[PDB]
Design a protein that fits this description.
It is classed as de novo protein. The structure is a homooctamer. The first copy, chain A, is an all-alpha fold. In chain A, 88% of the residues lie in helices and 0% in strands. Chain A contains 1 helix and no strands. Chain A starts with a helix and ends with a helix. The complex binds decyl-beta-D-maltopyranoside (4 copies). One decyl-beta-D-maltopyranoside sits at the interface of chains G and F.
């Protein structure tokens, strides 16, 4: 359960980071 | 570069949590 | 779109924290 | 107090994101 | 249980950060 | 510098986790 | 101690934003 | 505009955290 929660959080941060990276592209 | 590094770290964290989730199963 | 995802992320976080808070109450 | 602070912080963030989502309409 | 897995994860992350600090220098 | 700051946050988390872990010990 | 750590995180955020603000100036 | 607003908000947050840190001691 906690692993799942951590994965969801990391996935959100990764998508956020990706949109920032694309904005700077 | 900052956003890219954060995206990479977050994707590694997500993979690591997924692996833990699959192991805990 | 960014704002909407951030709000969803935060709601999920609040729900997790609330659960923790309730366990400690 | 830790969990309660975390809950308050998450709820604050959710409120701010929601206000932002509404403004961006 | 939860705290021990969280301490272990946090230590791994700190080591990864430290490695990156040394590589970047 | 970012890696250094990441490291401090990670160390902070690990010590908070250890304090909880010791109370559960 | 938690408030002191939160202050440090907020200061880091402020410096990061200031960096961006200056480059955008 | 965005970076300036983020800087302002982070500074507000830091002052709040500092005030709390001083109240607690
Ligand atoms: C917050 C979570 C961050 C965890 C980062 O873990 C590291 O991620 C790096 C990728 O940036 C990897 O390359 C490295 O091997 C790994 O240890
Ligand atoms: C607020 C963040 C919380 C903790 C974040 C921890 C992030 C650390 C991930 C960085 O990982 C590094 O990235 C690169 C990939 O090769 C390398 O350079 C380095 O050698 C590796 O270690
Ligand atoms: C709970 C709010 C925290 C928000 C995000 C975490 C902020 C982490 C910033 C670093 O804070 C410092 O971390 C040091 C070790 O790295 C500690 O040294 C001891 C120190 O005492 C603490 O001040
Ligand atoms: C990878 C992300 C990590 C998540 C957060 C981890 C942060 C770890 C501690 C950072 O250290 C802080 O760095 C700030 C910025 O370098 C400094 O503020 C500096 O800049 C502020 C912003 O104006 C001023 O208010 C301060 O006086 C000035 O010291 C502050 O003193 C220092 O303690």
């Amino acid at each position: 359960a906690x692993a799942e929660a951590a994965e969801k959080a990391a996935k959100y941060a990764a998508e956020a980071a990706e949109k920032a990276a694309k904005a700077x592209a």
